[PDB]
């Protein structure tokens, strides 16, 4: 069924599973036209498909040309997402195909179910976790590849860098969701935290800085403080 805090360790068992987040597929800016009306301009988006055990991120870049001359784009975006996830599964060797796909938004259930009718043994599930994957475009190297794309493209990343050499998947996912939640809540302050110290850099082949184990503890504490600080500012606490 649905996925929540009771069965959270299930994410890190040995059954292949993918999260799918569609919140950055259809991205628009709203602006005033010459006649005083409002018009939208689309910008490139992406599907965020993540294996939470391994960190493998299948980032399908959605180029604005896919919306040309289409209507009800917010509805189409869900079906385009389902089409692309189905295509990804079919491209994977059988032993790499997921046993479950967990969608972050329940509006993705029917589109994905219909596209995956040929895979009756892949479970399509919602989750009751509120996951901050919309903030993926706050990761500079992900935002850069999406905005520079001139055509549809799939790019593969490991969103955990090399962390799994030193920590468990459970801990890596918890670190990722804390980082993304902080970037979602206050992007400027989170990036300041991550880059404040010039002697710690991001390797060419990584997304995040090369923190030692002790520095990650400090960083994680500063991210928790940011989230709590912003909660106090929001609710006047």
């Amino acid at each position: 069924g649905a996925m929540n805090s009771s069965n959270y360790a299930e994410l890190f068992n040995n059954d292949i599973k993918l999260f799918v987040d569609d919140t950055n597929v259809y991205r628009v800016t709203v602006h005033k036209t010459f006649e005083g009306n409002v018009a939208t301009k689309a910008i490139n988006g992406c599907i965020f498909t993540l294996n939470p055990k391994t960190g493998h991120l299948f980032l399908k870049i959605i180029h604005t040309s896919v919306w040309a001359g289409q209507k009800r784009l917010s509805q189409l975006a869900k079906w385009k997402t389902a089409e692309e996830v189905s295509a990804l599964v079919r491209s994977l060797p059988k032993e790499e195909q997921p046993k479950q796909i967990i969608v972050t938004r329940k509006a993705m259930l029917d589109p994905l179910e219909v596209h995956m009718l040929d895979f009756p043994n892949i479970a399509i599930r919602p989750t009751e976790l509120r996951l901050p994957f919309s903030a993926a475009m706050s990761i500079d190297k992900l935002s850069d590849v999406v905005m520079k794309a001139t055509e549809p493209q799939m790019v593969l990343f490991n969103i955990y860098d090399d962390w799994l050499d030193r920590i468990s998947s459970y801990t890596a996912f918890s670190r990722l969701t804390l980082l993304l939640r902080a970037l979602k809540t206050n992007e400027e302050s989170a990036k300041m935290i991550l880059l404040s110290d010039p002697t710690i850099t991001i390797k060419s082949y990584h997304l995040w800085p090369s923190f030692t184990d002790e520095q990650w503890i400090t960083i994680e504490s500063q991210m928790r403080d940011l989230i709590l600080t912003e909660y106090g500012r929001k609710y006047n606490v």
Partner: protein, 300 residues
């Protein structure tokens, strides 16, 4: 006009004949139903006074044989049987009529409700949904499951309605996923009408039969089928105009006939609100919408 005689009435029972019903007391001198209109299928149905569990009954057409009812004290029910001795049968009916031991089918000369409810229902199609090939009449009861209900348990006692499933490969062309799910015209017109039913008359016959089994027996799987067949049409952008015109007429009669106090259990709020107010055909069901709003405004 034809006659279904009863050997006797040994247990107290409410007897239905089509949309009519009457009570018979234990061992009362009741010997059947005469003046039964030729030209329509009919259903004779039963609910025991001492055990309202199991409504059950028999679909039949008096043009296909001489049928009668006899109580079986071992299986505990009124059974329909066919009498092959025509002269014996006529002699029995004539005697019971002479002694005025039969009730007259209560049709009003102005009243076309049965024809309107069974316009497309034929015995041959009933006998393909209800499989018991040795009888010319068909038994249905409140508990019988449908083939689709048995896929999600005795196959010989099942209602073989046409399976409709909106999230199935039959309903959804590879490569037309969005198109076929948001608009069901392919599934309605190519798969169901052209492919399975052959024409809209057979589709409407099964829809009408499902409704009547839902209403007369409280058969839940029949109610599911009735609503699925409505939703398939309403959720299709492209439907032949004559089908749209006739469906409104068919649905109006079904909503008008339903017992007011059974509406909570025989009508699916989601389906009706979607069909009347959100679907492609939301503006094609004039009279069905008018009677629904005046008779069941709560559901909406």
């Amino acid at each position: 006009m034809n006659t279904v005689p009863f050997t006797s009435a040994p247990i107290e029972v409410t007897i239905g004949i089509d949309q009519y019903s009457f009570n018979v007391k234990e061992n009362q001198p009741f010997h059947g139903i005469k003046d039964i209109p030729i030209g329509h299928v009919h259903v004779i149905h039963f609910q025991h006074a001492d055990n309202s569990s199991m409504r059950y009954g028999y679909w039949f057409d008096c043009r296909m044989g001489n049928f009668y009812i006899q109580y079986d004290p071992k299986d505990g029910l009124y059974k329909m049987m066919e009498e092959r001795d025509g002269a014996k049968f006529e002699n029995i009916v004539h005697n019971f009529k002479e002694r005025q031991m039969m009730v007259s089918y209560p049709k009003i000369d102005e009243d076309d409700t049965w024809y309107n409810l069974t316009e497309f229902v034929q015995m041959d199609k009933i006998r393909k949904i209800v499989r018991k090939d040795e009888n010319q009449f068909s038994y249905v009861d409140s508990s019988m499951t449908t083939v689709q209900e048995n896929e999600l348990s005795d196959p010989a006692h099942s209602l073989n309605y046409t399976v409709i499933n909106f999230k199935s490969r039959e309903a959804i062309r590879p490569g037309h996923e969005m198109e076929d799910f948001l608009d069901k015209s392919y599934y309605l017109n190519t798969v169901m009408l052209q492919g399975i039913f052959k024409n809209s008359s057979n589709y409407f016959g099964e829809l009408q039969f499902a409704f009547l089994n839902a209403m007369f027996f409280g058969n839940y799987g029949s109610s599911l089928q009735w609503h699925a067949m409505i939703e398939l049409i309403c959720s299709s952008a492209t439907v032949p105009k004559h089908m749209l015109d006739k469906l409104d007429e068919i649905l109006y009669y079904q909503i008008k006939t339903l017992p007011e106090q059974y509406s909570d259990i025989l009508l699916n709020e989601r389906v009706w609100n979607i069909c009347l107010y959100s679907s492609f055909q939301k503006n094609s069901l004039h009279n069905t919408e008018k009677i629904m709003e005046n008779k069941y405004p709560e559901l909406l």
